[PDB]
Structures are given as C-alpha cells and as structure tokens.
Amino acid sequence: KWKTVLAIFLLVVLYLIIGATVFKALEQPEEGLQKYRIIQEKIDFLSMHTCVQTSELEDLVKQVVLAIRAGVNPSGHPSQESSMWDLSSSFFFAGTVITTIGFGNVSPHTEGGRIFCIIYALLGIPLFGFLLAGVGDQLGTIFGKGIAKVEKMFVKWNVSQTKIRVTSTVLFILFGCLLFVALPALIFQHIEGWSALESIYFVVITLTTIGFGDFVAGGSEIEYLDYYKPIVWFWILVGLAYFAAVLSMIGDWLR
Amino acid sequence: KWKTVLAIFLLVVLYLIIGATVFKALEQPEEGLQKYRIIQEKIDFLSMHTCVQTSELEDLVKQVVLAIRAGVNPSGHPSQESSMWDLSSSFFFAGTVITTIGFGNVSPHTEGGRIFCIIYALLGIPLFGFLLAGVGDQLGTIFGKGIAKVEKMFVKWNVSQTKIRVTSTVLFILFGCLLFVALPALIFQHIEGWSALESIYFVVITLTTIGFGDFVAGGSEIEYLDYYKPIVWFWILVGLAYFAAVLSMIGDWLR
Numbered sequence: 001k002w003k004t005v006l007a008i009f010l011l012v013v014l015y016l017i018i019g020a021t022v023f024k025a026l027e028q029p030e031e032g033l034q035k036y037r038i039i040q041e042k043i044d045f046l047s048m049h050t051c052v053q054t055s056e057l058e059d060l061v062k063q064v065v066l067a068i069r070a071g072v073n074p075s076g077h078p079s080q081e082s083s084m085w086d087l088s089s090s091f092f093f094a095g096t097v098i099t100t101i102g103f104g105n106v107s108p109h110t111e112g113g114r115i116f117c118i119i120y121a122l123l124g125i126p127l128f129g130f131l132l133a134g135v136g137d138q139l140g141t142i143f144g145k146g147i148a149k150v151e152k153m154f155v156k157w158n159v160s161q162t163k164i165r166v167t168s169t170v171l172f173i174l175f176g177c178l179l180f181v182a183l184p185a186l187i188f189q190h191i192e193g194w195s196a197l198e199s200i201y202f203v204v205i206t207l208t209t210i211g212f213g214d215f216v217a218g219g220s221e222i223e224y225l226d227y228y229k230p231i232v233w234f235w236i237l238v239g240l241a242y243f244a245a246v247l248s249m250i251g252d253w254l255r
Numbered sequence: 256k257w258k259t260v261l262a263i264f265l266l267v268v269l270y271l272i273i274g275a276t277v278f279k280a281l282e283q284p285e286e287g288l289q290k291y292r293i294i295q296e297k298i299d300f301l302s303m304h305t306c307v308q309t310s311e312l313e314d315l316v317k318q319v320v321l322a323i324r325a326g327v328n329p330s331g332h333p334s335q336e337s338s339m340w341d342l343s344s345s346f347f348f349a350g351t352v353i354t355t356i357g358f359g360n361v362s363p364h365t366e367g368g369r370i371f372c373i374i375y376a377l378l379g380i381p382l383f384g385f386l387l388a389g390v391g392d393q394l395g396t397i398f399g400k401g402i403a404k405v406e407k408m409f410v411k412w413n414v415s416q417t418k419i420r421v422t423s424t425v426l427f428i429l430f431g432c433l434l435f436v437a438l439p440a441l442i443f444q445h446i447e448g449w450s451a452l453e454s455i456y457f458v459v460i461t462l463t464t465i466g467f468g469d470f471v472a473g474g475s476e477i478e479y480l481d482y483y484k485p486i487v488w489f490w491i492l493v494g495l496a497y498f499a500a501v502l503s504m505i506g507d508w509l510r
C-alpha cells in the first residue's frame with residue numbers, strides 16, 4: 001500500500017534526522033580541537049624558522065596532500081620496490097570491487113583505468129551475487145538437514161518445540177559470529193597492532209559491505225606475507241556466504 | 256548442483272586474476288611517476304631552504320598526513336566556523352551509512368561515535384533494505400501493468416509478444432538510465448566542475464554502492480547550495496529505487 005510505503009519512508013527520515021543530530025553532537029568538538037592543534041602547530045613551526053616562507057610552506061603542504069590523494073606516502077621515502085599496485089594488492093582490490101566493499105584506500109587514476117573499473121564492476125557484480133546466492137543456498141540446505149536431525153523430540157526435555165527451533169537458530173548464528181567476527185577481530189588486532197575496538201570496527205565495516213577506508217587490512221607497509229590479501233579476501237567471501245545462508249534460513253522461517 | 260557452483264567459483268577466480276593483472280599493468284606508471292616527483296620536489300625544497308632539516312621536513316609531512324587522517328583540511332588555515340560535522344553533512348553521512356554506500360570522506364573518530372556508527376548501521380541497513388524492496392515491488396508491479404497495457408495496445412499483430420516485451424523493457428531501461436545518469440552527470444559537471452568522465456565515474460560508483468570516495472558530491476570546501484547533501488542523497492535514493500524495480504521486473508520475466 002502507498003500509505004504504508006510513505007509511513008516507512010517517514011520513519012526512515014526520522015531515523016536519519018536523529019542519527020544526524022547525535023553524530024553532529026558527538027563529533028564537532030574532536031575536529032574543532034584538531035583544527036586548533038594544526039593551526040597552532042603551523043604558527044609555531046613558522047615562528048621556528050624565519051627562513052621558511054609561509055606561501056612556500058602552503059605550496060609544500062598542497063603538494064603533500066596531492067601526493068596523499070594520489071596514493072603515495074611522502075613521509076616515508078619510497079624505494080619503488082613495494083609497489084602499492086602489487087599483484088596481490090591488485091587481486092585484493094579486484095575482489096573488493098566485485099564484492100561491493102570499496103575501501104577506496106587505493107583508487108585508479110588513469111582515465112582508461114576508470115573506464116575499465118566501471119566495466120569490470122558492472123560485469124562482475126551479478127556473477128559474484130549469483131555465486132554468493134548459490135553457496136548460501138548450499139549451506140542453508142546443509143543447515144536444514146542438520147535441523148531435521150535436531151528435530152527428534154530428544155535431548156530437549158520437551159520444553160517447547162518453537163523454543164527449540166529458535167534456540168537452534170540462535171546457537172547457529174552465535175557460533176558463526178564467533179567464528180567469523182570475534183576471532184578474525186582478534187587476529188587482525190594482533191597482526192596490525194590496532195585496538196580491540198578498532199579491529200572489531202574494521203571487521204563489522206568490511207563484512208557489512210560498507211568499506212569506509214579509515215582502517216584497511218593492508219597498510220603502513222609492515223610486511224604482510226604468505227598471500228595476506230588472497231586469504232583475507234577468502235575470509236571475506238566465506239563470511240559473506242555464511243551470512244547469506246543465515247539470511248536465507250531466516251527468510252524461510254519468516255515465509 | 257554444487258559442481259556447477261564450483262565451476263562458477265573457478266570462473267570468478269580466473270576473472271579476478273585477469274582483472275588484477277590488467278589493473279597492475281595500467282596503474283604502475285602513475286604511482287612510479289608520483290613517487291619520483293615527490294622525492295625530487297622534497298629534495299628541491301631542501302635545496303631552497305638549507306635551514307630545514309630533512310628529519311624536521313618529514314616530521315611536518317607526518318603531522319600533515321595525521322591531520323588528513325583526522326579529516327581536517329591542512330592546506331591554508333581552517334576556519335573555526337567551517338564545521339565538517341554539521342547538520343547537512345551528518346544527514347548525508349547517515350544516509351550513506353544506511354544505504355551501504357560508504358564514501359569515506361568523513362568518519363566518526365570519537366570512540367563513542369564509532370560504537371554508535373556500528374549500532375546505527377546494524378539497525379538502519381535492514382530498514383532501508385525493506386523500504387527499497389517495497390518501493391521496488393510497487394514500481395515493478397505498476398511497470399508490469401503498464402508494459403502489458405502498451406504491449407496490448409500498440410503492437411498486437413504479426414509479431415512475437417515476448418520480443419515486443421523485451422524491446423519495450425530495454426527501451427525503458429535505456430530511458431531511465433539516460434534520465435538518471437546523463438542528466439545528473441551534467442548537473443555535477445556544472446556544480447562540481449568535474450570532467451564528463453569523472454561525472455559518469457561518480458554516478459556509476461554511487462549507484463553501484465562501491466563507494467570509493469575519490470569523488471564526493473560535497474567536498475573541497477568550494478561552497479554549495481543550502482542542504483545540497485540531503486537532495487543529492489534523495490537523488491541516490493530515487494535512482495536506486497528505480498533500478499531495483501527494473502531488476503525486479505527483469506527477474507520476474509526470467510522466472
């Protein structure tokens with residue numbers, strides 16, 4: 001019904017308004033303090049060296065931010081051997097493109113690169129969706145067979161059959177979340193030296209296909225080896241397949 | 256069958272390998288040239304001002320990159336009034352979070368904001384998905400009725416009705432794409448002053464929900480119209496609803 005659709009739309013609008021207000025209130029001071037700090041640091045450095053011209057310093061900072069947007073780190077002197085568009089890195093980038101994650105830490109800069117990226121995404125996304133649906137359906141069929149094994153009126157004390165089904169689904173999703181969210185969060189927390197909050201935020205963002213780009217699996221050149229990019233892409237695929245299977249089972253229960 | 260699923264998996268692996276190879280081959284020279292350019296510009300800046308120590312220069316570059324990761328504009332002096340986390344930008348950020356776009360030009364740096372960002376995404380993504388599915392279902396139903404009407408009013412003799420339906424559906428797809436890609440491309444080619452290739456790249460990324468972040472509707476502090484971010488998000492919403500309805504009709508015909 002059109003009225004129901006408009007009611008849902010208005011609810012979404014109210015949710016967005018509330019989220020915008022709370023985000024503004026919970027972020028304004030941080031960036032205010034950062035602006036104050038960078039302004040006072042720039043003034044102190046200009047007073048430190050009278051030789052440096054302020055316009056020249058601004059030109060230098062402009063070139064630094066241009067290089068940052070290009071995708072090369074100016075703070076560390078590059079040896080050109082650790083190419084950012086490495087073969088494993090390119091494989092990870094293509095995997096994220098077809099997965100609709102889009103971290104954006106590395107982006108194509110050539111015009112032909114942009115055209116090829118557009119064509120590649122438009123061709124690959126339906127194929128990846130088809131594969132994900134197939135694997136999720138396979139895992140859902142296996143889980144349904146497991147539930148049919150569970151439905152035996154035994155080792156449940158006959159409390160409530162609906163409670164038993166709900167408990168089985170909850171245990172399945174809990175075990176899957178523990179296997180594919182918390183444990184990879186700990187692994188990334190140890191490997192990348194981040195905090196637990198940072199690692200769990202990275203895992204949630206990556207799996208939910210958001211891809212903010214503030215935290216990337218490969219960054220700051222700390223010698224990721226043993227095909228780190230292929231295995232992290234494989235973990236992404238397995239987790240997404242599991243979540244798709246759980247969603248398919250949930251849709252089966254709802255309908 | 257699981258066998259053809261594994262075959263599709265091998266096809267996806269091959270596609271990713273080919274894409275990675277082509278991307279690396281295309282994007283090596285740009286990063287190489289940028290590395291050499293930044294190295295030679297830093298040595299030139301050291302030559303111009305012998306007072307500056309190279310370690311202090313790299314420290315200043317490190318501070319600039321840290322401010323870039325913070326989200327403020329390092330070049331020039333950021334005005335205190337120019338709060339990046341204002342109402343309109345927060346509304347756009349919340350909309351992109353629920354839509355799963357995830358551009359990444361802005362992100363909650365405060366730990367409290369991060370926790371709320373995780374909870375907000377987890378709650379809002381299902382609601383926006385349900386709203387999009389409902390709007391797509393309604394629009395697809397009226398599309399099917401209208402296409403059946405115009406099919407059985409204009410051409411009814413000496414042809415195949417399936418071919419007529421396919422041709423009319425392709426015509427509608429093309430017209431909707433031209434009204435939802437080319438016209439926004441021109442609008443962005445005026446307000447944002449991007450080249451036509453950049454505008455179509457931005458539209459393709461935005462509607463696909465890749466969300467690279469190299470191009471953002473509101474950025475560079477170039478000044479925009481009142482509540483430009485909400486209206487551009489509304490454009491995103493409309494385009495996504497139309498394309499979801501079209502794909503639903505295509506799936507209905509396929510089924």
Ligand SMILES: C=C(C)[C@@H]1CCC(C)=C[C@H]1c1c(O)cc(CCCCC)cc1O
Pocket residue numbers: 100125207208209240243244355462463464495499
């Ligand atoms: C045409 C694409 C690429 C689809 C469908 C239409 C639009 C506007 C966006 C895309 C999209 C996802 O790519 C992924 C999800 C959620 C996946 C969750 C997996 C756990 C939703 C979702 O709408």
Ligand SMILES: [K+]
Pocket residue numbers: 100101209210355356464465
């Ligand atoms: K997405």
Ligand SMILES: [K+]
Pocket residue numbers: 101102103209210211212355356357358464465466467
């Ligand atoms: K993204």
